[PDB]
Symmetry: D2
Subunit: 142 residues, 4 copies
Amino acid sequence: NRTILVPIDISDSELTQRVISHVEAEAKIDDAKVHFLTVIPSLPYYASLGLASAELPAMDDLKAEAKSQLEAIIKKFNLPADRVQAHVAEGSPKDKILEMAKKLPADMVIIASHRPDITTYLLGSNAAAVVRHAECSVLVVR
Amino acid sequence: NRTILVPIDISDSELTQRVISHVEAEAKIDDAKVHFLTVIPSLPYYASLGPAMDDLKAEAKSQLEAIIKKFNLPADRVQAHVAEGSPKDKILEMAKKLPADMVIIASHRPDITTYLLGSNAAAVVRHAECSVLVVR
Amino acid sequence: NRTILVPIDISDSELTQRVISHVEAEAKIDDAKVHFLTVIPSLPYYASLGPAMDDLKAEAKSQLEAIIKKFNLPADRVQAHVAEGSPKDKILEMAKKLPADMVIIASHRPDITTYLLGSNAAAVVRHAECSVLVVR
Amino acid sequence: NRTILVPIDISDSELTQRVISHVEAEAKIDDAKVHFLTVIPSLPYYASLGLASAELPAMDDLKAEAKSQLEAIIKKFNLPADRVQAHVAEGSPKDKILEMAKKLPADMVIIASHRPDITTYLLGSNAAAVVRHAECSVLVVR
Ligand SMILES: Nc1ncnc2c1ncn2[C@@H]1O[C@H](COP(=O)(O)OP(=O)(O)OP(=O)(O)O)[C@@H](O)[C@H]1O
Ligand SMILES: Nc1ncnc2c1ncn2[C@@H]1O[C@H](COP(=O)(O)OP(=O)(O)OP(=O)(O)O)[C@@H](O)[C@H]1O
Ligand SMILES: Nc1ncnc2c1ncn2[C@@H]1O[C@H](COP(=O)(O)OP(=O)(O)OP(=O)(O)O)[C@@H](O)[C@H]1O
Ligand SMILES: Nc1ncnc2c1ncn2[C@@H]1O[C@H](COP(=O)(O)OP(=O)(O)OP(=O)(O)O)[C@@H](O)[C@H]1O
Ligand SMILES: [Cl-]
Ligand SMILES: [Cl-]
Ligand SMILES: [Cl-]
Ligand SMILES: [Cl-]
Ligand SMILES: [Mg+2]
Ligand SMILES: [Mg+2]
Ligand SMILES: [Mg+2]
Ligand SMILES: [Mg+2]
């Protein structure tokens, strides 16, 4: 039965805190499996400044860390342990979200509109791309 | 408790058929009130080139009421509305006035063209102050 | 050399007045050919509720030709066109068919509402294969 | 007279190479001043993984470096030296582009649609935001 994708940006509490009741409600409808995905973004510009000569941490360690934080966030959702799965990817958030939505495949993607503290843009760049490009239903949470 | 706005384009059966399961589900979560709205478009271009709106509104209301019979919803929790104007304008205005907690809309009319999101879905998902479910 | 497509909404004087200086400038860079297009909208909603298009097309052509007289462009480098359909559809189709090297469009009808980019400008800037100047 | 903003992402040759003839042509119309801006993007997510405990280079040095590369890119435009100015900022590219467009103020912003090598998205996140949110004309170059 139903598969729901919940992209999580571990860098912000509220983008997560907002979706909780929606993800739970959508899941309870028919005991769906809920896949949570955090994406460690690629750094093309910093790359051009010589930062990877210059050094960022190993991607293997960055993913292990991002995964541990995602795992803590997942536990904030009241969902049975067998209906949940944690994923970490590397890339543009929108690219990897859309890739996973296709690969699973997702029947619904549940995302926040944007970061709370910034009002100006009514839709964030990832939310906007995902809404437009997903092949499945997309719930934009406000 | 919750209020759900369901904009319906009475001229497209598939846009309407597509959201049925989602509306029914979303309503049942907490016995929400469901408002259906259809909007008779403004024709400003035609105005530049030179029946009664009363009558068009009654026909649209009649067709929306028949469409509502395709949804399993409690009769006492449902309301139908007809408006005149740009659809996105009147959808957004009703979302603020109700106010709506969710708007449920289909993405676009699928066809042989390259678009992925319709002009009204795009404006609604962007400008609504509440959550928006874009159905595919 | 270059081909410039200039979609005109004949019903809005300001959308048209706003691009005049940009079209004139863009043309003069290299003595470009300028194609003006106005699109008579499709009314599928009205079709669901139940004069001649020949006649509407001739009136629109006539109004577009009068609008073209507000531009300083060489008469031999200008062409006017009228189409029927969704404006963005027919704009994009003509941009591919000419093909256009640039499309020059105004952003939106400014008014008391929150929108910043009109439905046709948005689709054109996104889907055109060539450069697009969005005029403010 | 006229002021043109040309946002440049120093991390890609073609996003730059494409705009050249357009920027020159727009400038020659009436001897406009051309402001070039590169934005060093803020790294909220990497921040949450402890990378700034963990270390990226000093922002002062990152800006000096980004500026030196921008300066080389600017010289690829056939423009008089007194009608050109280089800027570096820190933040979201779209935020800082829009800020500068307002502050100058810009009469036109000239931007590429997206990165060449990625076809999927017809408009990049920064291009899309700038087109929508700029108060002035925006030329999207393809
Ligand atoms: N790195 C990420 N990994 C997983 N999901 C993400 C990531 N970034 C964003 N998202 C998803 O997209 C939602 C909306 O965030 P988005 O990035 O589009 O807004 P924003 O941060 O305000 O925009 P911008 O990133 O353009 O500043 C998030 O709530 C989350 O669901
Ligand atoms: N006239 C209308 N009245 C009420 N709601 C509408 C109307 N038109 C569209 N909608 C709502 O918006 C949805 C998406 O339709 P939209 O018009 O955005 O797609 P489209 O017709 O493919 O795009 P466009 O009208 O740009 O060509 C519909 O499922 C419906 O929920
Ligand atoms: N009927 C049309 N024919 C030809 N070009 C048009 C037509 N309508 C709009 N355009 C082109 O698109 C531009 C922007 O108009 P647009 O319709 O996108 O704004 P809007 O009317 O504010 O939005 P909407 O029609 O969504 O409410 C116009 O300046 C014109 O270049
Ligand atoms: N860091 C930057 N500083 C200055 N301008 C930028 C920056 N990033 C993008 N731009 C401007 O925006 C244009 C289009 O790039 P955009 O980032 O929107 O496309 P993309 O890289 O394909 O998208 P994404 O960044 O969403 O992957 C660039 O050509 C450039 O003019
Ligand atoms: Cl926005
Ligand atoms: Cl699209
Ligand atoms: Cl907008
Ligand atoms: Cl796109
Ligand atoms: Mg973000
Ligand atoms: Mg429609
Ligand atoms: Mg219009
Ligand atoms: Mg980019």
